Design a protein around this ligand. Sequence first.
Ligand SMILES: Nc1ncnc2c1ncn2[C@@H]1O[C@H](COP(=O)(O)OP(=O)(O)OP(=O)(O)O)[C@@H](O)[C@H]1O
Ligand SMILES: Nc1ncnc2c1ncn2[C@@H]1O[C@H](COP(=O)(O)OP(=O)(O)OP(=O)(O)O)[C@@H](O)[C@H]1O
Ligand SMILES: Nc1ncnc2c1ncn2[C@@H]1O[C@H](COP(=O)(O)OP(=O)(O)O)[C@@H](O)[C@H]1O
Ligand SMILES: [Mg+2]
Ligand SMILES: [Mg+2]
Ligand SMILES: [Mg+2]
Lengths: 384, 174, 359, 372
Amino acid sequence: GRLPACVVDCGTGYTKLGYAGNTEPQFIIPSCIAIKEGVDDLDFFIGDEAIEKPTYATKWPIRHGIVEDWDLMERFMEQVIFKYLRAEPEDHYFLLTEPPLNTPENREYTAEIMFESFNVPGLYIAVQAVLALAASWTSRQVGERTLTGTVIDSGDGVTHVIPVAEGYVIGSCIKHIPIAGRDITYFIQQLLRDREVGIPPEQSLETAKAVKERYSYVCPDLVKEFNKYDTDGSKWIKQYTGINAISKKEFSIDVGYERFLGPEIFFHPEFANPDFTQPISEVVDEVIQNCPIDVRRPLYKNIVLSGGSTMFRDFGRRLQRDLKRTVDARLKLSEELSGGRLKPKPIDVQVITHHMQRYAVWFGGSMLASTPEFYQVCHTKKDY
Amino acid sequence: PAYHSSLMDPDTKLIGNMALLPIRSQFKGPAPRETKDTDIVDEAIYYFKANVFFKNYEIKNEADRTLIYITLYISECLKKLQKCNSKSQGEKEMYTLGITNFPIPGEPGFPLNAIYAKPANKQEDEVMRAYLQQLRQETGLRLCEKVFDPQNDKPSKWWTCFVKRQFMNKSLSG
Amino acid sequence: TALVCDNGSGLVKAGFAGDDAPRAVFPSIVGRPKDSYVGDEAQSKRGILTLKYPIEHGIITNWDDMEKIWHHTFYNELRVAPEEHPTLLTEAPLNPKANREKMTQIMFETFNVPAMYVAIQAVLSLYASGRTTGIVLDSGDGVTHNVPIYEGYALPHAIMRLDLAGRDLTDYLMKILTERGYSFVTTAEREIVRDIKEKLCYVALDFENEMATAASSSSLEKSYELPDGQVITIGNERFRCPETLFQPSFIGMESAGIHETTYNSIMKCDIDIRKDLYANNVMSGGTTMYPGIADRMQKEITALAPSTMKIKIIAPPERKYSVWIGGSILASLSTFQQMWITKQEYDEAGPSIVHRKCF
Amino acid sequence: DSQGRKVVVCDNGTGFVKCGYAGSNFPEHIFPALVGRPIDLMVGDEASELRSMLEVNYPMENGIVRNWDDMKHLWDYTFGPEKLNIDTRNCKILLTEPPMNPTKNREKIVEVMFETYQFSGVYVAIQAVLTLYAQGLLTGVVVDSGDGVTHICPVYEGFSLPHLTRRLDIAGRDITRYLIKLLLLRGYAFNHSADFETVRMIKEKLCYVGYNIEQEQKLALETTVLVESYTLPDGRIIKVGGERFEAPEALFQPHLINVEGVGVAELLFNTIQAADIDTRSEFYKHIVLSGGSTMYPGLPSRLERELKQLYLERVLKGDVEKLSKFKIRIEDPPRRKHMVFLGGAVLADIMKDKDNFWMTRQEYQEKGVRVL
Ligand SMILES: Nc1ncnc2c1ncn2[C@@H]1O[C@H](COP(=O)(O)OP(=O)(O)OP(=O)(O)O)[C@@H](O)[C@H]1O
Ligand SMILES: Nc1ncnc2c1ncn2[C@@H]1O[C@H](COP(=O)(O)OP(=O)(O)OP(=O)(O)O)[C@@H](O)[C@H]1O
Ligand SMILES: Nc1ncnc2c1ncn2[C@@H]1O[C@H](COP(=O)(O)OP(=O)(O)O)[C@@H](O)[C@H]1O
Ligand SMILES: [Mg+2]
Ligand SMILES: [Mg+2]
Ligand SMILES: [Mg+2]
C-alpha cells in the first residue's frame, strides 16, 4: 500500500474518478469527448470542457451501457489518467467497473487497452451488484451484515434488477425495465412545452434537468394531490428563475403539476412508454420468486437502492407499501387454500436508503481496494 | 391502478349498458331527479385530471360506461373552449355546444364501439339520444366555473394543458 | 479429558470425555469449486461447489477428503492441539482389516496422537444402555446392521448387513411427494423434504387398516410451513415412508425387513444364551426416532418366537447420540489407563504395530 | 373392423406423442404434448409456434399423470377430427407402459378408457419387450432415454426383469437446461420459460459427443473450426463454439449439473454385472439403444470404448490377450426414435385376429379387473 489504488467508473451519462480510501469521488464529469473534424490525435477535450465548444464535434462513446467506439475510450482514459488524476500507470493498481451481462470480448478489449498501452501492473474488473451491496453496511445495524440482497440499479440508461445470494450474482434472474432518468427528463420537457411560454428552445433540456433535480417527489395518490394543488396554490406552487444565453435577460416559470408526475413513470410506465406496462413493484416480486427456494426470505429483507434516479423523496416507501400489499394477498390465498388451521409467518419486506446513494459503486470500490489482501486478487502483468 | 366506477346502486337500469343515475338538472330532460348534490358529474370531473394518461382501462362495472363517456366529452369541451375570452360568451358557446346530434353508440361513426351494447330495440334509441345530449349539456355549467378563473376572467393555463391528450388514445371526434 | 470423535456417513460427532452431550455435530460432506470448504459453509455456497461424500456405506472410500474432515475436526470445531491427550475412534463392523490401520498410519503421520483404542461402533452402545449382553441395531444413515454382543465380545459369524438406511427412505418420500402434485426437484430441495420426515412420520400396526382409515376418513392430514410462506397439507405418506424398513419390496430390494433379521441374528447362536438375548434387544442410531417403532417390533417378534417365554424390547430417549456417550463413559475409567494402543509401542516397534496389535 | 383392420397404436410421452396404425413402418402422426391457457384451450401443435403469449403445462412425467383433466383434452385431439378421424366405437388399442409404474395408475387409464370413450379392445405393453420385438430378438438389454429419465432394463424371453432395472435422473430436459446456463456466459440471455423451445433447436442441430476429449480441446483452443453461427426468429445471429461438446457430457459425467451417480457407461456395467453368470454373455452381445436422447453423433462410438476399458481394469485386470475372445456389440439402427412404435406395429399385426390378446369390453362389465 505504498500508493493507493485508482478507481474509475464509466457510465452512459457520467464518469467518476478517484483514489482508494476516500469517501467522495474527486471528479464527477460528463462522459463526453470533443475532437476536431502529425500530433493532431491529441487535440481533444473531455468532460466539462466538451459540453460546449465552437469548432469541435462532441459525442458520447458509451451508449446503453456498452462501448460503441474504442478509439475514443482509449483517448478518454489517457486524459483521465494523465491530466485529472495525475497518476503514472506503471505504479498503481486499477479497479474498473463492468456493466451487468457483459460479454467476454468487451471484457478482454479493456484489458488489452490497459495492459498493452499503459503498462498497468494490476487490473480488477468488478461486478456492480456486490460493490453496491457492500456500501449498504454504512447505515445498518451491527447485527446484520450479509452479501444477500436484491439491487435496483437505476441511472441514465436502463434499469436493472439483480439478485445476489451469498456473494455471487444469479445471472438468469436479471430483468430490465427500460425506464431511466433520460426518459423522465424527456417526459417533463413535453409537459413543460404545453403550459408555459418563456423557455428558449436551446435551454429546454437544462431547465428540464434543473426542475427535475431541485423540486421533484412522489405522492401516495394522484387525485388528492391534484385537488390540493388547486385548493391551496400558495403552498405547493413555486417559481424558478433562469438566465438566458442571449443578452442575460432573466426569465421566470412556475412549477406546478410536473413536480410529482415526473418520477411517477417508474410506477406507471404506460404514461410515457406504450410498449411496456408492468410496474416496478411487480418486477422485483417476479424476479425474487424465480430463485432457489431457500433464499427467498433474505432477499425480501434486504432490497438496496443504487443509482442517481432513486434519489427522489419517498421512493422506497412506495416500493415497500406495494410489495407488502402484493405479498400479503398471496399469503392470504395460500392460507385460505388450506382451511384455517395454520397461519404462515408474514414475510418482512424492507428497503434500505443511505447517505451514499448516488455513487455507491465507487464507494464500494474504494472500500474493497483499501484492504491489504486486495493485491492478491488482481491479474498481474505476466498473466496477460 | 386505474380509477374504476363509483356509486353503483343495486336497483338501477341498463338501457344499452349505460347506468341512469340521478343528476341535478336545471335545463330540461326526462329523468329521475336528484335529492343530493354529489352527482356522477361532479364525481367524474374530480377524477378527470388523473385519468387522461391511462391508455388501458378495465370494464369493471356497468356504470363505468358512464365514466367512459363524460371523461371523453370533457376532452372535446376543453379542446373547443380555448380561444374564448368572456365567461358569459364561453357559457353561451358551451350551451350551444349541447345542441348537437352527436352519434350515440350503435351506429357507424362512434369510435371504441366494441365495448358497447347496440340498441336494436325501437325504444332505446330515443332515450339514449335524449340523455347523452342532456349529460353533455349539463357538464357545461359545472365546467364553466373551473375552466375560467374568477379573478381575471380568462381560461386558466392549468386547465388548458390537458388539451392534446386522448383517453385510451381514441377521442369522440374522429 | 479424552476426545471421542465418532465418524458416520451422515453427521460426524466430536467432543470431550467428561461431558454428556456431543459438542460438535456437523455434516460429513466435502465441497470443491477455496478447496477447504467442509461442513456448513460447504452447504451454504451450493451454487458453486460440487459437493461429494467421503464416507459411503460405513467404509471410507476417498481418503484425502477424510483427512480434510479430520483436520477440520481438530482445528475449528474443537480449537485444541492434536497431541494434547489421547483420542478415541470408531469404525463399523465387517470392515477390511487393513483399513483399520490405514487410518492409524495417516493419523500418526500428521498428528502423532499419544494413544488409540480403535473399536467397533456397536460394542459400546450396549454399554451406554447399561449392560454387557444383547442385540444391537445400527440403524443409521449409510447402512443397517444386526450385531449380537456377549460379555463385550463381537461375534463375527453372527452379524447381518442391510443396505436400507435413511437416504433411501428420503428418496422414496420424494418419489411419493411427486405424485400428489407438490413437485420437489433437484438436490437443493433435499434439506426441506428431510424436514417433513423428522416430525411428520410414524409407524402403524395394521398397515392395511391404517391405509383404509386414511383413505376413508380425512382426519390423518397435517399442515406444514415451508420456508416460503406456502403451507402444504400432507396425507397418506405419513406411514408409507417408514414401512419400507419392514417391507423392502417397495423400493425394489428383495432383502428381508429389519423384523425378520432380528430373528436370524439369534438363530445363528447357542442354545443357552437365547434366554439372555431375547430379554434385552437394544435400539440405536439416527433412523429409529419414529413414534411407536417399539410396539411394531414387540408385536412382530411375538408372532415369530416361541410362546413359552418373554420378549422385552427397550430403548432410551437419547438414542441418537448413544454412540457418543458410550464412548465417553469408556474412555474415562479407572483401569482403562494400561491397555491403550500407546505411542511408545509405535516408537519402539517402528512400522510394525500395523500387523501386531490388531486386538 | 370385421376382419380386424382398424387397430391403432399410440406412444404417449412427456415431450412427443406418436400415433399410427399397425402394419406401417412409420408413425402416422407426431405432435408435442403441450396444453396451455392464455394469460379457450390451445392444445397440440398450436402451443409450439406461440408460447411466449401462452401459459403451458405438461400433463405427464415418466408415465405418471400430473393432472387428470388435461389428458382427456389431448386424447380428444389425437382421436379427433384433425389427426386420425377414427370412429371410436369400432377400434382396438395398444398402449405403452414405462418400467416400474404403480398399480393405481395402470388400472386408472384402463378404467377411464372403457368408460368415457367406448373402445372395443385394450392392451398395455412393456416398452422393453416392444423395443426388442422390433429388432427380432427376445433376450436383451434396453437403454432408453428421452425427456424423462434414462432407464436401463434387461429382459429375458418375453418377460422383463423388474428386479434388475436401474434408472438415471438426467435426460434431454436437463441437457437443454444446462445449455442455457452455458450460453448465458457469452452475452446471450435466454429466459427459462419462453425460450425453452428456441434453444432446443440449437441442441438438436449443433451438439455432439466427443470421442477423445483431448483432440476436442486442442481443436477448441488452437483452431476456430468449431464455432458456428445460428440465426434466430428475431433476426439476430448468435455464435456457438466449444459449448457443443460440453452440454451432452452430463450423461457420461453426471456431477456437472449436481446429480449423484455413476453415469450411463458405468451404470450399464453395474447392471450387466449383477445377474447370474450364465446369462451375462447373452446380454453383452445384444444391447439396443432407443429414444430420441441417444441420437447425438458419437454416442454409439463412446459406450463401446467405455465398456471395453471398464471391463479391462475391473474384471480381467491386465493380460491383454483374451479381450479378442470377449465379444461386445451395441446395436443402434438409424431408426432409434420410433422403436417403441415399430414394435407396437408388429405385435398388433401378428395377434390381430385371435381374441385373447385384447381385454374385452364385456370383461369389465362383470369382473372389473384383468389377469392377462
Ligand atoms: N436528485 C438527483 N441528484 C442527482 N442526480 C439526479 C437526481 N435526480 C435525478 N438524477 C439523475 O441521475 C443521473 C445520475 O447519473 P448516474 O451517475 O446515476 O448514471 P450512470 O451510472 O452514469 O449511468 P448508467 O448506470 O445508466 O450507465 C442523472 O441523469 C441525473 O439527471
Ligand atoms: N437428433 C437429436 N439430437 C439431440 N437431441 C435430440 C435429437 N432428436 C431429438 N432430440 C431430443 O430428444 C428428446 C425427444 O424425446 P422422445 O421423443 O424420445 O420422447 P419420449 O421417449 O416419448 O419421452 P419420455 O420417455 O421421457 O416420456 C427431446 O429432448 C428432443 O429435443
Ligand atoms: N428426528 C429424526 N427423526 C427421524 N430420522 C432422523 C431424525 N434425525 C435424523 N434422522 C435421520 O438419521 C440420519 C442420521 O443418521 P446417523 O445416526 O448420523 O447415522 P450414522 O451416525 O451411522 O452416520 C439422517 O440422515 C436422517 O435421515
Ligand atoms: Mg451506476
Ligand atoms: Mg451412526
Ligand atoms: Mg418414450
